[PDB]
Amino acid sequence: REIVSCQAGQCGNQIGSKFWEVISDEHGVDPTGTYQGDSDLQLERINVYFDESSGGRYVPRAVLMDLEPGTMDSVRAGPYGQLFRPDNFIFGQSGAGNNWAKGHYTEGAELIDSVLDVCRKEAESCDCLQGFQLSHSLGGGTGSGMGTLLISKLREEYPDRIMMTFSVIPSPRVSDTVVEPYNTTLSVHQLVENSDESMCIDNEALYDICFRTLKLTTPTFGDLNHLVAAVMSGVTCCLRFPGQLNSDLRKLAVNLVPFPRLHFFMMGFAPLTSRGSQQYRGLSVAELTQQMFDAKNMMQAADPRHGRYLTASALFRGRMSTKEVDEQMLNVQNKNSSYFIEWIPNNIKSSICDIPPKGLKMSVTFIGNNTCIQEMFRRVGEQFTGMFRRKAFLHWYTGEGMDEMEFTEAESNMNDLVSEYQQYQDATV
Amino acid sequence: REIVSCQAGQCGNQIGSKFWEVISDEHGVDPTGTYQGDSDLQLERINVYFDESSGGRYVPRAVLMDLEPGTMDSVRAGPYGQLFRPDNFIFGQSGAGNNWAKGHYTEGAELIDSVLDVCRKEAESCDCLQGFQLSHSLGGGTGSGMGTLLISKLREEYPDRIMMTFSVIPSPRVSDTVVEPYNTTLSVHQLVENSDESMCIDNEALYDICFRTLKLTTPTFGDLNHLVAAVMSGVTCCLRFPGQLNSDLRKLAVNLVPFPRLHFFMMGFAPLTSRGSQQYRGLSVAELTQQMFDAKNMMQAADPRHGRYLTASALFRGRMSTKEVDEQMLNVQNKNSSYFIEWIPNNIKSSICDIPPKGLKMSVTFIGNNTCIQEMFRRVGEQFTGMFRRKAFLHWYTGEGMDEMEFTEAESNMNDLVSEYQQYQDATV
């Protein structure tokens, strides 16, 4: 029941930092490394994420990994930076420069050997690993290229372990770089073959959440990272805590991956109510269900109405009646059977833990393999081919040591990956 | 067993706010949302107009609707404005301009979907919703256009539900805007079809009651709205409280609608006592009867003496005598013969509820499908014909995507309705 985490790039480092400082708060871990919790269920499975030391300190089983050293300096300057293991801060001298190859082929390849060394050193100390978690962004240069290099490298030595990849993938309205298309098209297929299932986060859905769902006039990246870390922590809730109807990452994979290549998911979380609406809203799983399935409450910039859900799962946390929660999942199933796929009965999945996050009597993490990822992948592929037709910005890769053939192959990889979703969504019995 | 309320336009917003004022007063609901009443039966049907929250508070099942956020601020700052949910407080950016075209086709179209979503959420929260209750004004653009658009779009998938649509029809002597006839003509025809029940308001009779029945020195819109909110509560009093002979919205519909198109009604409240004659009047059903059908005490701006009572009903509140009530109604039927249609003898219905309003020993709400309403409809159809002969103000409506044919169809439908009223009032056995 052990998972070891890795953060790649600036985005990965920040998101993993926030995830670590929320999971340590959940487990009652001092920023200095000691224990200040009041409950025993935390210490029962604290070993899943924190490695105990001879001195009684619980250091995160995390590998911080970024070519830029400024991100390492910032994460150490953070309030929970001293918690992290010092020799896990593997960093280069020159940044990747928003390039695929500068993190995946030439500079990352030299750096990645020490990362594999330290990662397997952490792995061996565990009795047995459930698997490897990665947090990165295909939008970033080193977050995408070098993270995908690690993705490829772990498979050849850990074939039958879960690979939980949390990527942060962009959209043009909040596109902060002009190399988003290249950096995601060259990255998608590494996730395709070399990850058992990847759960994706969109930048713009998070801003939509903060503006419309939570009514925040000043949400920052720190504000966004906790919302992402909510799912980051709720995915492993059954791992870390006892459950009335427990589950795990292998449970989620086997229950949400009917066919091997359909393993890209969209995320949802609950509850998400603004403080003003928090007063007048009764915190119950009954309302948490429409918070689960609501369009603007989603963590992906793809409207569920356009797509059709293949398989979805729900991780409930708290003290709720499994009776009522199961009948609610049935109710949403038969209320919108058109949205779900007909030839798989009970497309929604129930999993019930006991421990909810801090202060929340009840919480929900939603996982969904909706076909609406078709829109997002098709549109980003169109963005790619728009400049790929003109041989523009491609000189960086060609000079750095990359060929045209793999470019064409990756474009074909999205083409025949995204071609699946419409022909599974329009299928008839 | 529960009713969801909707408010359209600023007039609808004010009337819904004071309706919630009187409902909270009757049910002992603190403006803070807590219960402060001193009765046990008062909490028996608290769920009819309220939903319980996690904190032990009650929130109205109200949707607030408009295109000016200013009236949202006004109703929120109102004495009971801290009672409603914030998410129900849905509003637009730019108004309808008191133009049915923008209120129903462009400004309202982009937000009718959101109001349907929130209404559906409230309905699914309700265990069994037995009807909607909208309050609005036909003279305005926001209240009339998107107001009736809400009923039109909900009825397409709510077949057996009931519509308490209360609409303030303007008058020549309370002519507030020149496009009142266009606004009312474009909406009455739609209220004929989309709404099972419709109910009429005009400021003439309200002002007359405030002037002579109450001799209020300065009755403002507050008293105007309170006088009709007293009936807005009495329509469902029998549903919300136990009674000797119960009734509900479906009861009134079935016993007051002889033909499907004959669902335009008229209310009336009793007792109404002047500021200086409370003690001298002896509250009893004897003088209650003589003001049941009194034109000056009637709050519908069309003399019932110029028309015919197709059907009528009276919902009494308070401890009363069941032979006295029935015998007084029999006195009405055996004292008026040419205003009660001969082919439907004993048109009057009586319902009894045990609990009277606060501050009253016994009260009653009148409802009637009298044929005096065709005078209200012709006194605006004449104005519509006059302003439509010269094609005045049609450019504002046609600039938003409609044509003259829709106006002609609306005119024809209202002319057919008034013809039906005439041929159902002049009929002989």
């Binding site: 006039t217 949400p219 906790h226 603004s274 007063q279 | 407080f89």
Partner: peptide, 27 residues
Amino acid sequence: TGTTASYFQTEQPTVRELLSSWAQTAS
């Protein structure tokens, strides 16, 4: 502010406190 411009928000919390706490009736 409690006005409609601010979408009826008494105060603006960071998501950390927002998820670490839940609001109920103040009475």
